[PDB]
Each structure stands twice: as structure tokens, then as C-alpha cells.
Amino acid sequence: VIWMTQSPPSLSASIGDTVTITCRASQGISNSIAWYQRRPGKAPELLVYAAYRLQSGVPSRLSGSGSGAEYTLTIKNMQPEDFATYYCQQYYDNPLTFGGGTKVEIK
Amino acid sequence: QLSRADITTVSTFIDLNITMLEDHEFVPLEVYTRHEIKDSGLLDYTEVQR
Amino acid sequence: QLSRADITTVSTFIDLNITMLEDHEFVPLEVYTRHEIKDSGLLDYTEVQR
Amino acid sequence: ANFYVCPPPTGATVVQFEQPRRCPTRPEGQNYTEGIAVVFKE
Amino acid sequence: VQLVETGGGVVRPGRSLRLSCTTSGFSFSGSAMHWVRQAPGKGLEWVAVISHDGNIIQYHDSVKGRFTISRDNSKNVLLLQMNSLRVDDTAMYYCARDVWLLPATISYAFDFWGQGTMVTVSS
Amino acid sequence: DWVPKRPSVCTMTKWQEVDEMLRSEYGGSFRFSSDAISTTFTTNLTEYPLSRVDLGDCIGKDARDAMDRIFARRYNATHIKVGQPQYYLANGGFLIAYQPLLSNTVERIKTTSSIEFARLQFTYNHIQRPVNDMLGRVAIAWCEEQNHELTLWNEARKLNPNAIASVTVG
Amino acid sequence: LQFTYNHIQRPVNDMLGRVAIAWCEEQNHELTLWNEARKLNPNAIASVTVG
Ligand SMILES: *[C@@H]1O[C@H](CO)[C@@H](O[C@@H]2O[C@H](CO)[C@@H](O[C@@H]3O[C@H](CO[C@H]4O[C@H](CO[C@H]5O[C@H](CO)[C@@H](O)[C@H](O)[C@@H]5O)[C@@H](O)[C@H](O[C@H]5O[C@H](CO)[C@@H](O)[C@H](O)[C@@H]5O)[C@@H]4O)[C@@H](O)[C@H](O[C@H]4O[C@H](CO)[C@@H](O)[C@H](O)[C@@H]4O)[C@@H]3O)[C@H](O)[C@H]2NC(C)=O)[C@H](O)[C@H]1NC(C)=O
Ligand SMILES: *[C@@H]1O[C@H](CO)[C@@H](O[C@@H]2O[C@H](CO)[C@@H](O)[C@H](O)[C@H]2NC(C)=O)[C@H](O)[C@H]1NC(C)=O
Ligand SMILES: *[C@@H]1O[C@H](CO)[C@@H](O)[C@H](O)[C@H]1NC(C)=O
Ligand SMILES: *[C@@H]1O[C@H](CO)[C@@H](O)[C@H](O)[C@H]1NC(C)=O
Ligand SMILES: *[C@@H]1O[C@H](CO)[C@@H](O)[C@H](O)[C@H]1NC(C)=O
């Protein structure tokens, strides 16, 4: 099992600033990793795939990066609809494991 | 009024028949497998010693 | 006086595109080299006797 | 089938044919050089 | 697109329960399906996966041999027959479709998620 | 020195590391053709269960190690990994560990002692596929040309129906 | 295999090159007929050529 360490578990940001969420795996997974977003009271929705492929309709201002066992998700311009829980999941080897989750909130 | 096929028709085109090359599947084939070559020896030091 | 390209042009020819076969280079390839086949034996009379 | 009503044309729209295209050059033949050879193996 | 799940409820430990997930808005026969659970106040965890045609099945080590995933392309409905439940299985089960990137491959990622249903194991 | 068996012995050895392995389906079977080594392998479209290979733990490790190194070396800046690796049992006794890519734009396997059967498949396919493509264009062009000549024969007949009818009638 | 592929590619390409050259020479030859056929009936000639 590939454990997924996600940090910071919780941080606050203002509307119109930059944020960076780091996700780390227990072993090198090349680029097999996905990012999700779950707003309060709704089901999760995919954002990025393979750490670089942005999903259709996702804002261009949101992007991910990294390699090996280190990955990060960044947003250059936060919007009121971006404050939500973000999870990082890997698919390099089974079983699929999710990250601890990081809740971005208003500061 | 008469149909179009009621009058004799002559082909004014110079027909050229083109038959594409049919797909071919190659199966493995060996005159003597590696096992047969090994068995060709009258005696085997490995089996004799064992 | 007007240039030749000022009037719309229609191709009266029936284009036929011909793509020559690209050159291919074949590299050596063996499933098991003669050294590997020799090493497949558990014991070698030559080395054991030596 | 469909009939067609063609009004007389005028100089508003003009079309021309394409000029003869230069044909491709003949493919270059192989540059072989005859010679005797002996292949050696390990 | 819309995903609906039915079959949730309260069940005693060691008993069997069968869930169902209806789909609409996408070619069910041309996309794999996955099952995800969300325990109360915990993180997400994958459950199983069923290919587009159901030829290959993969499970999680915590549910291997206990659960049973299946699908019916004719009725475009996904099912997950659960047996030998445990207290640790209490979680919100979600049915999600894979990310369609190629014709017959499994992306092992989630693009569409359902509303989810509760499955509480209590005695 | 003592060591565990499963992680020390294998029944399959990594033979070749192909950077470009094109997979196509025709005639009810997948065909993995490699342009680098000039080889074509045929399978049954069903992923061979890796658990069926006796002592084959080194195959998930070796296959993934080569895929990660090859992907980062050449496919990181232009392609994306799609799904997990897929293992297919090819004709002749060759196990192919495949990793699909997308553009941004218990028993023992008996391997044959000669891959020349597969090389001929690639050579024939490399010569049949294009020749047929050029046989198909010539046929299409000929038909388009013949339909083009009709516009001239419809007018040439009025100038001299005797000569036009003679050649056309036979 | 290298010789076999070369023995089949070299000639086939030579015959693919002659056909292409002959086609171009033929098309340029037809223009001499279309330039005159248009005067006989510009309606039919323009229809097929214009599309
Ligand atoms: C031979 O090779 C070909 C490759 O050339 C191979 O695959 C065929 O390739 C074509 C072209 O790519 C395929 O057509 C595409 O298939 C997609 C179908 O979408 C599925 O998923 C939809 C939802 O997910 C997609 O979209 C979301 C965003 O909306 C995105 O986040 C996801 O990641 C994912 O990409 C889902 O809606 C859809 O179901 C709808 O559509 C189908 C018809 O397509 C209909 O039956 C359903 O009822 C429903 O309405 C489906 O489940 C899709 O990406 C793509 O869409 C583009 O094109 C269409 C026009 O065709 C546009 O309208 C649209 O906006 C997009 O631009 C497109 O349809 C085709 O499906 C493949 N064929 C097969 C059989 O799989 C062949 O398979 C190969 N053959 C062999 C024998 O191997
Ligand atoms: C691919 O599948 C075919 C069937 O589709 C397999 O054919 C079997 O071959 C064995 C050989 O001993 C026969 O006993 C079986 O009767 C065949 N099955 C059928 C349904 O005809 C074939 O072996 C498979 N090939 C590979 C490489 O796995
Ligand atoms: C094939 O070509 C010949 C002329 O060579 C023609 O008579 C025939 O109709 C064509 N088609 C078939 C189906 O034979
Ligand atoms: C190739 O042939 C097509 C017709 O099949 C033609 O339209 C095209 O211009 C030709 N040349 C190129 C460079 O595509
Ligand atoms: C892969 O490419 C991305 C850009 O697509 C780049 O940021 C990254 O550093 C590359 N990774 C490696 C390991 O070369």
C-alpha cells in the first residue's frame, strides 16, 4: 500500500491570493496521481490527472506540478468558490489511496 | 416516359481492377527446438551426475 | 493589367498523392544468444573438469 | 435527380484553370560499386 | 450527467447488504465503474472497480473476498453485493465512473461521483 | 547466505525495453508492433493474469522500473500515462507488459527459441500496409479520372459521333 | 530481412515514382483538351471543374 501524506491539513487564505498544497507519497510514483475538490455538501469533482493534465472546464489559474514522490497543487488567484477540501489520490499501484485532505477556508 | 435502364449502356471508362493484399498471419516455426537440440546429445553430464 | 493570381483558379487535374516507402533499418535480435543457451545447462563438463 | 435554372452569368465572378504543374524528378538510382567480398565470423 | 445510489441503511454486523448505483448521461457500457467509501470524519478510501464489460475485477485488501462487484450494461446499473459486514465498514459509499481517456483502458481515477448513501453497521 | 525464494528467483526475464509499442486491434486480436526492433506480437485481447505466472514477482518490479525510466526520459514532456500497466500473453510465449499512453495534442510460460516468426510479420505488414494504401489511392484516382473523362466524351460525340461510337461500342 | 525489405521497397518505390510522374504528365496533357472542351459547352465543363 502506498501511503499518501498530504500537508498542510488546514490553512486559511484570502480572496485573491496564492496558495500551495503539498502531497507526498511513501514511494516514487512517477506521475500517477490525481487531484480532487469537494465543496461542503457536495460530492467530489476531479481537477487534475497525472499531476499535469487539467480537466475540461477547470479554471486555468489552478495547476499542479511535481515529480517522483513529491507533488503540489497551486492556485494563482483564489476565488470564493475555490475554498473547499482538496484530496490527492494515486493510481500507480493498487489499492488506490487518497490523501489526508487539506481544507482551505476564509482567513 | 421511359426508365434510364431501358436504353443499352456502354461503359466509356477503362476499368482497372485493384485487389488489395490480403492480411497474412505468421505462426512460430522451428526445425529443432532448443529442447530437441539438447536431447540430441547421447549423454548429459547434468543428468548422469544427478 | 492584372496579375495571374487575381482571378480564382480551379484545379482541372485529378490529384494522386504518392508516398514512397520510408527506408527501414533492421537491428540484430535474438531471443537467446549462443552464450545464454550454453549457460542454460546446470553443469558444464568443461568447467567442472578444469 | 433535380432540375436546375441557370441565369445568364456576368463578369461579377470569374474562374480560371490551373497551369501545368512541374512533374517530380525521376527517383535517383542506387549508387552501387561492384566489388568482391569475403565475410568473416567469430 | 446524474448518478443515483440505492440500498443504504442500518445493518447488523456479519450480515449481507447489496447496493445499487443507477447511471444516466454517459455510455455505461463504454466506461469502468468504481466504488469509494467515506467514513465519518475520516478520509476517502477506494473499494473496488469493474471494467467496462466486467471481464476484470479488482478489490481493496480490506474488502477482498468479502465484497462482490458486478454490473449490468443492458440496464446500465452498477451493483456491489456486500457480505460479512463489520463495524469498521460504516461509511458513505459513492459510485463513480472512471475518467474516459482511451477506449478500453481503466484510468483508475474518478471524474463523476454520485450522491452517495449511508451504510451504518451497529448492534 | 540464505534469502527468501519468491524475491530471488523468477520464471520470466526482461528481454527488451521498447520505447514505442503501437497496439492495434484487427481480426479479433491485438497486434503489438514495435518499429524500433521491427517485431510484431499477437495476443487474445485478454490481459494475462500476472498471478498465474509461477514465481513472477520480479516481473511487476522489472516492468514498472523500465516504464518509469522510459516515460521520464522521453514521454514526460509530450505524453501522459493512462491507467496502470497491462500484461498480455503474446503468441510464441512472450509476455508483454504494456503501458498505454495518450498524446497531449499457476503455470510456466514456454518461450519459442526464434523470434524470426514475428519479424516476418512486421516486415510483411510494413510492406503490405503502405503498398495497399498506394494501391487504394491509385484505384480512387483512376475512378475520379474516368468520371472526369465523361465530361469530354459527352461533347466529343457531337463533333464526330462515328469515331466516338466506334471506339466506345467496340 | 534487410535485403528482403530493400529488394521489395527499392523497386516498388521506383514503380510508385514512375506512376506519379506519368500521372502528372497525363494531367498536364488533359489541360490541352479542357481548354477546348470549355468552348464547346462551358456549362458542363464549368460544372464538373467548379464542383
Ligand atoms: C479506433 O480508434 C478510435 C480513436 O480514433 C477509438 O476510440 C473512438 O474515438 C472517438 C474519438 O475520440 C471516440 O469518441 C469520443 O469519445 C468520448 C465519449 O465520451 C464518453 O465520456 C463522456 C464523459 O466523459 C468525457 O467527457 C468529459 C467532459 O464532458 C471529460 O471530463 C472526460 O474525461 C471524458 O473525456 C460521456 O458524456 C460520453 O457519453 C455521451 O456520448 C456518447 C457518444 O459519444 C453517447 O453514446 C452517450 O449517450 C452520451 O451522450 C461517453 O461516455 C468523448 O471524449 C468524445 O467527445 C468529443 O467528440 C464529440 C463528437 O464525437 C463532441 O460532441 C464532444 O464535445 C467532444 O469533443 C468523443 O465522442 C469514440 O467513442 C471511440 N470509440 C469507441 C468505440 O470507443 C476506437 O475505439 C478504436 N477502435 C477500436 C476497435 O479499437
Ligand atoms: C487465444 O484464444 C484461443 C481461443 O480463442 C485459444 O485457443 C485454445 O488453444 C488450445 C491449445 O491447447 C486448445 O486446446 C483450445 O481448445 C483452444 N480454445 C478454443 C476456444 O478454441 C488460444 O490458446 C489462445 N492463445 C493464447 C496465446 O493464449
Ligand atoms: C474487375 O476488373 C475487370 C477488368 O479487368 C472488370 O471486368 C470487372 O468487372 C471488375 N470487377 C469484378 C468484380 O470483376
Ligand atoms: C496529397 O494528395 C491530396 C489528395 O489526396 C491533395 O489534396 C494534397 O494537396 C496532396 N499533397 C499534400 C502535400 O497533401
Ligand atoms: C515533466 O514535464 C513537466 C512539464 O510538462 C516539467 O515541469 C517536469 O519537470 C518534467 N519532469 C521531469 C522529471 O523531467
Residue carrying C-alpha cell 491509385: F138
Q: Do F47 and E101 touch (CB under 8 A)?
A: no
**Residue to mutate, B10, B14, B15, ligand 3, most ligand atoms under 8 Å from C-beta:** B15
Q: Which atom of ligand 2 is nearest to the CA of F29?
A: 1
Across the interface, whether the CB atoms of F82 and E55 are under 8 A apart is answered no
Cα–Cα distance list, D33 to A14, C23, F149 (Å): 78, 20, 47
Task: Please say whether the beta carbons of E71 and E51 come within 8 A.
Answer: no
Residue F82 touches chain E, beta carbons under 8 Å: yes
Question: Is the backbone peptide bond immediately before A8 cis, with ω within 30 degrees of 0?
Answer: yes
Residue A38 CB neighbour total at 10 angstroms: 18
Count of other CB atoms within 10 angstroms of residue B9: 7
- Helices G2-40 & G42-50, crossing angle to 10 degrees? 150
Using alpha carbons, select from F4, F38, F53, A94 the residue that is nearest to residue E56. Answer: A94
Pocket test for ligand 4, best of C11, C13, C17, C20 (most atoms within 8 A of CB): C17
Dist. CA F80–CA F102, nearest whole Å:
5
Q: Which residue has the cell 493498487?
A: A94
Rounded Cα distance between E35 and E8, Å, is 14
Name the residue in chain D with its Cα closest to that of C15.
D21
Task: Give the residue from chain G lying closest to F133, CA to CA.
Answer: G16
Backbone dihedral region of F94: left (phi > 0), alpha (psi from -120 to 50 degrees) or beta?
beta
From residue F106, alpha-carbon distances to B32, F55, F56 in Å are 27, 9, 10
**Quick one: which of F148, F138, G30, G16 has its CA closest to D20?**
G30
- Chain A: closest CA distance from residue F36 (Å): 24
Which residues, 6 or more positions from F59, have their beta carbon under 8 angstroms from its beta carbon?
F10, F12, F50, F53, F87, F95, F97
* Of D17, D21, D27, Cβ closest to residue C10: D17
Q: How far apart are CA C40 and CA C24, in angstroms?
A: 34
Residue from F29, F30, F31, F44 to probe ligand 2 pocket by mutation (most atoms less than 8 Å from CB): F44
* Whether F167 contacts F153, CB under 8 Å: no
- The strand pairing partners of E23, in sequence order, are E3
- Strand spans (E) along C1-50: 8-10
Residue C6 main-chain phi, psi, to 5 deg? -75, -20
Q: Look up residue F46 and give its DSSP letter.
A: S
Residue F154: which residues within 8 A CB-CB, separation 6 or more? G41, G44
Phi/psi at G37 (nearest 5 deg)? -65, -30
Distance of CA E45 to the CA centre of its chain: 11
Number of residue pairs across D and G with CB atoms under 8 Å?
Answer: 31
Q: Does G33 touch chain D (CB under 8 A)?
A: no
Cell of F118: 514475428
Strands E117-121 and F21-25, by their bridges, are unpaired
Q: Which of E43, F72, E1, E37 is nearest to A51 (CA)?
A: F72
Contact call for C12 and D13, based on CB within 8 A: no
* CB distance F12 to F95 below 8 Å: yes
Q: For residues E110 and F7, give the distance between their C-alpha atoms in angstroms, rounded to a whole number.
A: 34
Look at ligand 1, atom 7, and give the residue with the nearest C-alpha. E103
Q: Which of A102, A54, A104, A63 is nearest to A80 (CA)?
A: A104
Contact A86, A102 (CB under 8 A): yes
What nine digits make up the cell of C14? 485529378
> How far, in Å, CA of A101 to CA of E108, rounded?
19
Indicate if ligand 5 lies below 6 Å from the C-beta of A67: yes
- Helix and strand numbers, DSSP H then E, in chain F: 3, 7
Instruction: Tell me the C-alpha to C-alpha distance, in Å, between residue D37 and each of A81, A86, D34, D40.
Output: 78, 71, 10, 10
CB E61 within 8 Å of CB E46: no
Helices G42-50 and F116-159: angle between axes, nearest 10 degrees:
160
What region, left, alpha or beta, does residue A101 occupy, with left being phi > 0 and alpha being psi -120 to 50 degrees? Answer: left
d(CA G4, CA F159): 54
d(CA A95, CA E48): 9
> Maximum distance among all alpha carbons in chain B?
100
Distance CA E34, CA E52 (A): 11
Contacts of C26 in chain G (CB under 8 A): 1-2, 5
Q: What DSSP character marks residue F72?
A: I
CA distance F155 to D36: 63
d(CA F78, CA A34): 18
Q: In what order do the strands lie in the sheet with E67-72?
A: E2-6, E17-24, E77-82, E67-72
- Cα(E27) to centroid of ligand 1, in Å? 9
Contact D13 C8 (CB under 8 A): yes
- Atom in ligand 1 nearest the alpha carbon of residue E31: 52
List, in sequence order, every beta strand (DSSP E) within chain G: none
* Contact call for F38 and G8, based on CB within 8 A: no
**Residue (of F77, F55, F74) closest to F66 by Cα position:** F74
Written as nine digits, the cell of F154 is 459527352
* F42 in contact with B, Cβ within 8 Å: yes
With contact defined as 3+ CB pairs under 8 Å, the chains touching F are A, B, C, E, G
Residue nearest to atom 7 of ligand 4 (CA): C15
Contacts by D10-15, CB closer than 8 A, 24 or more apart: D13/C8, D14/C7, D14/C8, D15/C7, D15/C8, D15/C9, D15/C10, D15/G46, D15/G49, D15/G50
Identify the CA nearest to F159 among candidates E49, E46, G37: G37
Nearest alpha carbon, ligand 4 atom 12: C17
- Ligand 2: centre distance to CA E105 (Å): 24
Flag if B18 and F136 touch (Cβ within 8 Å): yes
C-alpha separations of E114 from A91, C40, E32, F47 in Å: 20, 56, 14, 29
Task: Say yes or no: G20 contacts chain C, CB-CB below 8 A.
Answer: yes
Give the span between the Cα atoms of F114 and B30, in whole angstroms. Answer: 7
Q: Tell me how far apart the alpha carbons of residues E89 and E86 are, in angstroms, rounded to a whole number.
A: 5
What number does the ligand 2 atom closest to the CA of F44 have? 1
Cell of F88: 498480455
